[PDB]
Amino acid sequence: IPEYVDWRQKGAVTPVKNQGSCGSCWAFSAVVTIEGIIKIRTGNLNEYSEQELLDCDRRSYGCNGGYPWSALQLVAQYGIHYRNTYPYEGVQRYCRSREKGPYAAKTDGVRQVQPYNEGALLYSIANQPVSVVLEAAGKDFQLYRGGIFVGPCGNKVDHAVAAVGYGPNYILIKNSWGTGWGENGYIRIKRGTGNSYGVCGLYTSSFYPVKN
């Protein structure tokens, strides 16, 4: 794999979004990977509906939290609609997929990255955007405003985001707190420190969608 990867430059990342005050970070994370893999396979970049996952994934808790892996399997089992047809509301409602018509896209499956292994995760990112978790509760993360972030932070993950590239000393992460946070909405987290948890527990739980 190359020394640098940035899916943004390859036209596979859509604009940064703001989840607002609704704990839907699991859904936003999932969508970034779906937007990613559809672009890689068909050449076309489209935005997909976070709202649809928020309302339909029965294993998840709507604005109270959820699991990016549950979302991804829903996209594999059923499909997902375009963001335009099923726009983000910032609160859980009821599943309206039925009244939106045919799904815009469908994946074939989900795969998990081997955890606590920097190399395995870099290898996946080199193939496509990946959904990852990290500890975002600490003030340093919340006030992050740029630079390569080294912490401080522990490993009590509580936030799902998406990894969209890397370089010699960092991993590139797209957050869903809008553009006024971090580097226009992104963060560069330090890698290569030799801690198997990863900085802020970044290597704990990573999943990516498969489409043939």
Curated annotation (Swiss-Prot):
Temperature dependence (free text): Optimum temperature is 50 degrees Celsius. Unstable upon 65 degrees Celsius.
Disulphides: 22-63, 56-95, 153-200
UniProt effect for mutating residue 32 to S: Slightly enhanced thermostability and higher optimum temperature. Enhanced thermostability and higher optimum temperature
Keywords: Allergen, Disulfide bond, Hydrolase, Protease, Signal, Thiol protease, Zymogen
GO biological process: proteolysis
Keyword Zinc (UniProt): no
pH behavior: Optimum pH is 4.
Domain of life where this protein originates: Eukaryota
Residues annotated as the enzyme's active site: 25, 159, 175
Binding site for E64: 25
Activity modulation notes: Repressed by the active-site-directed cysteine protease inhibitor E64 (L-trans-epoxysuccinyl-leucylamide-(4-guanido)-butane) produced by Aspergillus japonicus. Inhibited by the inhibitor of cysteine proteases from Trypanosoma brucei (TbICP, rhodesain) and Colocasia esculenta cv. Kaohsiung no. 1 (CeCPI, tarocystatin). Repressed by leupeptin, a peptidic cysteine, serine and threonine protease inhibitor.
EC number(s) given by UniProt: 3.4.22.2
GO MF, one annotated term: serpin family protein binding
List of residues binding leupeptin: 25
Protein family according to the UniProt entry: Belongs to the peptidase C1 family.
Stated role: Cysteine proteinase with a high level of diversity in substrate specificity, an amino acid bearing a large hydrophobic side chain at the P2 position is preferred.
Name the record gives this protein: Papain
